[PDB]
Amino acid sequence: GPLAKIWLAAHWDKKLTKAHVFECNLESSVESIISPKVKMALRTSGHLLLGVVRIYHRKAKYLLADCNEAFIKIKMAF
Amino acid sequence: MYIKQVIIQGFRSYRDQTIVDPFSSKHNVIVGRNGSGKSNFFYAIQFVLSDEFSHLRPEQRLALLHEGTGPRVISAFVEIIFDNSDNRLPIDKEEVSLRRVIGAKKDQYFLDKKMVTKNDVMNLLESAGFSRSNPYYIVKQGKINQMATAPDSQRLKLLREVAGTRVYDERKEESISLMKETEGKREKINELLKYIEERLHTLEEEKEELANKKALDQFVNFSEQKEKLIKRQEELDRGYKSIMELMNVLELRKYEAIQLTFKQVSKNFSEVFQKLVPGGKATLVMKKVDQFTGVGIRVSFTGKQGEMREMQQLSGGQKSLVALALIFAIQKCDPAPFYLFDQIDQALDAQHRKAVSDMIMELAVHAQFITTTFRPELLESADKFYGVKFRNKVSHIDVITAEMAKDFVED
Ligand SMILES: Nc1ncnc2c1ncn2[C@@H]1O[C@H](COP(=O)(O)OP(=O)(O)OP(O)(O)=S)[C@@H](O)[C@H]1O
Ligand SMILES: [Mg+2]
């Protein structure tokens, strides 16, 4: 499912591309940790909780990079 | 993924380099004399995978190099090779080659022949389904003794550990730290989208009084690029609120963890026992943190009667079997890809020896086993057979036929 991506984000996170970070929907990745089809050990719910927060971090990591170029590009011509 | 092959050089009774023939994907059984090198082999695997041996004192460094007659070695290595033909290891090879080398003041891993950090490995493994939280991929008779004699308290000390109620908190903290480190970016972001917002608003009033220049040309581009970021911040501002719903629901479920893993493992317990001892009846009893003081066992081999016995009143190998049943029920609650067993039948007769060999023939279809025995019953369930000889200050391990193994444990 999508949990394979979150899983991969929690441990071997360097196998996620910018396009995967962007295309990934945090809202529905959460929706499938909270309502799992095979209810999971609390030990792996926390592994997932970390994988999500990695992506949320890395999303903000890119937005803030983009948001600065957007500022210096218009601060320049003006 | 399973263990396809192992290589040892310089490690305990293994002076010269030994390259074990590649394993069956199912039940492998090793046989050998006393002090021959069985439990040394299992220790080599552990030197690579098991989390305890990741950080070694300078004396354990010395207690691993082959100490003996010749030029007393200064470095030793072990290489495991995993059959990745299930891609459970996040890597685009059919075989993964993880090795660890050690000397005095020297300790380095090698993932497919390139160096890595000890932390790198423990993450690559965790994501293959191989917890550093899981101590039960490997069972020695040390643990079966320790678990048959153990009191009702030490067994509750075992559920608290299985519920994962402590690693969850370890991650839950690792999470709230990022969550805050990230919540820092969000106030930086939410601030540049206030400069760009107002710098673009005056740039529009400049544009309207005309009814410098290169900014006025592509204003609508700046406008268009900005509202795209606004979209992304509204994504964050919305996934944040979502992660909070998650964190909330997990803390509710941590306080149901212990009561939860009890009922599962109790149910698994009675299952494993009723097929190890067909006819039997066994159960776990919660007894008076919390007001939980212990987890005791109530077994009735004798069919199921008013011949239930609390567990310390059981026989000596009856306690061995029940400890083995508990280890089976717990692994069901947390499967691993391969299991190492080091003399588990040592205290059971010949009938309970079979019943354990039978019940491993079942689990072999779904995971790998490598085991050592002294009696021919864990030999019928098996698919490949090895012997360990000791010949000339060193250990040799080679493939033997199934009759070579029975002739060795029946003579
Ligand atoms: N660092 C070492 N260097 C050389 N030999 C060692 C070293 N450590 C242990 N040995 C010897 O390795 C031999 C075999 O060790 P083990 O693997 O425990 O054999 P074993 O098959 O487990 O024997 P059992 O468990 O009694 S049936 C023993 O004679 C040890 O004394
Ligand atoms: Mg031994």
Q: What is the DSSP string of B196-226?
A: HHHHHHHHHHHHHH---HHHHHTHHHHHHHH
Hey, is B110 helix, strand or coil? strand
Question: Hunting for tokens 């943190």 — which residue is that?
Answer: B289
Pairing mode of beta strands B18-19, B114-116: unpaired
Per the structure, the complete domain to which residue A18 belongs is given by 3-76
Least Cα distance to B312 among B303, B304, B322 occurs for B322
- Copy the structure tokens of residue B341: 């067993």
- Give helix B219-254 / helix A42-76 axis angle, nearest 10°: 160
Tell me how far apart the alpha carbons of residues B289 and B107 are, in angstroms, rounded to a whole number: 39
The CA-CA-CA angle for residues B144, B366, B90, to 5°, reads: 105
Hey, is B346 helix, strand or coil? coil
> How many domains does chain A contain in total?
1
The DSSP code for B280 is: -
Annotated binding site of B for ATP: 32-39
What's the alpha-carbon Rg for chain B, to the nearest Å? 29
Chain A: residue nearest B258 by CA?
Answer: A42
Is residue B78 within 8 Å of residue B8, measured between CB atoms? yes
Is residue B56 within 8 Å of residue B80, measured between CB atoms? no
- The answer to whether the Cα torsion of A44, A45, A50, A53 is positive or negative is positive
Instruction: Give the containing element (helix H, strand E) for A3.
Output: helix A3-10
CB atoms within 10 A of CB B382: 23
Helices (H), B277-386: 316-332, 351-364
Hey, is B154 helix, strand or coil? helix
Flag whether residue A67 sits within 8 Å of chain B, measured between CB atoms: yes
Burial profile B75-84: b = 16 or more Cβ within 10 angstroms, e = fewer: ebbbbbbbbb
What's the alpha-carbon Rg for chain A, to the nearest Å? 16
Is residue B402 within 8 Å of residue B385, measured between CB atoms? yes
Residues in a beta bridge with B388: B32, B397
Tell me how far apart the alpha carbons of residues B373 and B390 are, in angstroms, rounded to a whole number: 17
- The answer to whether the Cα torsion of B126, B132, B134, B137 is positive or negative is positive
The CA-CA-CA angle for residues A32, B93, A46, to 5°, reads: 25
Pairing mode of beta strands B2-9, B338-342: unpaired
Residues in a beta bridge with B75: B103
For every residue of B25-64, DSSP letters joined together read SSEEEEEE-TTSSHHHHHHHHHHHH-SGGGS--HHHHHTT
Chain centroid to Cα B310, Å, comes to 31
Hey, is B170 helix, strand or coil? helix
CB atoms within 10 A of CB A38: 5
Tell me how far apart the alpha carbons of residues A59 and B232 are, in angstroms, rounded to a whole number: 9
Which atom of ligand 1 sits closest to the CA of residue B388? 21
Residues in a beta bridge with B297: B284
Query: Which residues does A11 contact at the CB level (< 8 Å), separation at least 6?
Result: A47, A51, B90, B123, B124, B126, B127
Tell me how far apart the alpha carbons of residues B404 and B402 are, in angstroms, rounded to a whole number: 5
Chain centroid to Cα B3, Å, comes to 14
Least Cα distance to B176 among A29, A47, A25, A50 occurs for A50
Question: Hunting for tokens 């004396």 — which residue is that?
Answer: B59
Query: Measuring CA to CA, how many Å separate B305 from each of B260, B266, B280?
Result: 28, 19, 10
Query: Measuring CA to CA, how many Å separate B203 from each of B110, B209, B250, B309?
Result: 58, 10, 48, 86
Pick the CATH number of B1-130+367-411 from 1.10.287.110, 2.40.128.720, 1.10.1740.10, 3.40.50.300: 3.40.50.300
- The answer to whether the Cα torsion of B325, B326, B332, B337 is positive or negative is negative
- Copy the structure tokens of residue B313: 């009143």
Tell me how far apart the alpha carbons of residues B411 and B275 are, in angstroms, rounded to a whole number: 31
- Copy the structure tokens of residue B95: 């075989």
- The amino acid that residue B323 corresponds to is A
Identify which of B179, B188, B203 has the shortest CB distance to residue A53.
Answer: B179
Is residue B160 within 8 Å of residue B258, measured between CB atoms? yes
Tell me how far apart the alpha carbons of residues B122 and B134 are, in angstroms, rounded to a whole number: 12
The CA-CA-CA angle for residues A42, A47, A52, to 5°, reads: 120
Tell me how far apart the alpha carbons of residues B151 and B156 are, in angstroms, rounded to a whole number: 9
Identify which of B182, B195, B225 has the shortest CB distance to residue A56.
Answer: B182
Task: For residue A72, count CB atoms less than 10 angstroms from its CB and return exposed for 0-12, middle for 13-18, buried for 19 or more.
Answer: exposed
Least Cα distance to B137 among B20, B42, B31, B12 occurs for B42
- The amino acid that residue B394 corresponds to is V
Method: X-ray
Region class of A20: left (phi > 0), else alpha (psi between -120 and 50), else beta: alpha
* In chain B, where the domains are located: 1-130+367-411, 169-254
Do B175 and A42 make contact, defined as CB atoms within 8 angstroms?
no
Residues in a beta bridge with B102: B76, B107
Resolution for this PDB entry, in angstroms: 3.1
Do A43 and B174 make contact, defined as CB atoms within 8 angstroms?
no
Phi, psi of B380 (to 5 degrees): -80, -40
* Ligand located closest to B12 CA: 1
Query: Measuring CA to CA, how many Å separate B148 from each of B25, B163, B274, B312?
Result: 30, 21, 18, 8
Query: Which residues does B318 contact at the CB level (< 8 Å), separation at least 6?
Result: B299, B301
Tell me how far apart the alpha carbons of residues B342 and B28 are, in angstroms, rounded to a whole number: 12
Flag whether residue B249 sits within 8 Å of chain A, measured between CB atoms: yes
Query: Measuring CA to CA, how many Å separate B5 from each of B42, B97, B275, B357, B371?
Result: 13, 9, 32, 24, 15
Mind telling me how many Å the CA of B228 is from chain A's nearest CA? 10
Q: Is residue B37 within 6 Å of ligand 1 at its C-beta? A: yes
Tell me how far apart the alpha carbons of residues B130 and B123 are, in angstroms, rounded to a whole number: 9
Tell me how far apart the alpha carbons of residues B310 and B64 are, in angstroms, rounded to a whole number: 42
